[PDB]
Amino acid sequence: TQFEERHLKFLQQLGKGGSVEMCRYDPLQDNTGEVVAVKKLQHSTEEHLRDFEREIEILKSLQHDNIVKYKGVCYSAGRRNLKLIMEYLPYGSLRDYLQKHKERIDHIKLLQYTSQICKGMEYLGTKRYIHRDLATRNILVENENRVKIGDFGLTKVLPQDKEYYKVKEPGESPIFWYAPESLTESKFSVASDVWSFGVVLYELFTYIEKSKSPPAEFMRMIGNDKQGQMIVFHLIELLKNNGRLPRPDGCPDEIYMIMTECWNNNVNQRPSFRDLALRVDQIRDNM
Numbered sequence: 001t002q003f004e005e006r007h008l009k010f011l012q013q014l015g016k017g018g019s020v021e022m023c024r025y026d027p028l029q030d031n032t033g034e035v036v037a038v039k040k041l042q043h044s045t046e047e048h049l050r051d052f053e054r055e056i057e058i059l060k061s062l063q064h065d066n067i068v069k070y071k072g073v074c075y076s077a078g079r080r081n082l083k084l085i086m087e088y089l090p091y092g093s094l095r096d097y098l099q100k101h102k103e104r105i106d107h108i109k110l111l112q113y114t115s116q117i118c119k120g121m122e123y124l125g126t127k128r129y130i131h132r133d134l135a136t137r138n139i140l141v142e143n144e145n146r147v148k149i150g151d152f153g154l155t156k157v158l159p160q161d162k163e164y165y166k167v168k169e170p171g172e173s174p175i176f177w178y179a180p181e182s183l184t185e186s187k188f189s190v191a192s193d194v195w196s197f198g199v200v201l202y203e204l205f206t207y208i209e210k211s212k213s214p215p216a217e218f219m220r221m222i223g224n225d226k227q228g229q230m231i232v233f234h235l236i237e238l239l240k241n242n243g244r245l246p247r248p249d250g251c252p253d254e255i256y257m258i259m260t261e262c263w264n265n266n267v268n269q270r271p272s273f274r275d276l277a278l279r280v281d282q283i284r285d286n287m
């Protein structure tokens with residue numbers, strides 16, 4: 001079924017990278033229609049369109065409780081400058097949601113979100129998709145009891161014969177969430193996604209205290225005087241020599257263990273998401 005543009009009423013801006021807006025889909029024209037989230041492109045060159053169209057196919061192929069739901073596409077005369085339509089998740093980003101509620105969400109709740117993040121990523125892996133941008137600002141909160149993986153604008157499908165995807169011309173990169181081989185060779189895989197997931201679990205257990213974020217720690221470790229491409233040079237040598245983010249204040253030592261195990265230089269030694277979700281649920285059972 002179709003989403004017609006004249007019926008999408010703008011409500012509020014949500015994020016720019018394209019750009020995401022909260023709209024009401026109101027075909028009855030009486031303001032009782034569904035509130036939806038809508039993405040469209042900012043500058044519509046053929047390469048960005050091609051990436052957007054891929055993001056749309058990927059999201060459309062995913063149906064999991066912890067993956068944001070695709071609803072449809074709104075099409076357009078002359079240019080066919082699509083809008084992506086999705087479910088609106090009303091508590092917003094997990095980063096912003098944890099900042100607001102800080103330590104008033106206990107370790108048990110944090111582990112419920114962690115579990116659901118692993119479950120979502122694991123499902124993503126059974127399809128041979130590499131997310132590439134797992135961080136708390138890219139996870140969305142549906143309610144107290146449920147989070148979903150979002151932002152698929154950077155996801156790649158592995159080739160049929162290879163276990164990594166190599167980016168030739170990197171654009172915007174969240175280097176502080178990156179695996180060493182992604183920093184050095186621009187190789188991305190299930191294992192690099194697991195490494196990032198380690199950084200997400202750190203984020204969670206620091207409750208997003210700013211002076212504690214990944215960029216902050218890593219910059220203190222490399223020295224705050226490093227600028228541009230020298231940050232990458234230094235971060236790579238630091239990672240090689242086993243500099244890591246510390247264990248956050250109050251973090252249970254068994255959760256810290258998972259982090260450090262995700263942050264292994266040897267890609268083959270990082271655990272799998274299936275095992276992570278098993279482990280994380282066992283820890284929940286215990287508490």
Ligand SMILES: Oc1ccc(C2=Nc3ccccc3-c3ccnc4[nH]cc2c34)c(Cl)c1
Pocket residue numbers: 014015016020037038039055059068086087088089090092093140149150151152153
């Ligand atoms: O491939 C994807 C996956 C998730 C979203 C998405 N992104 C956002 C980006 C910034 C700020 C808020 C959102 C947001 C807020 C509330 N509900 C929402 N549903 C869906 C999104 C969202 C998008 Cl645009 C594309």
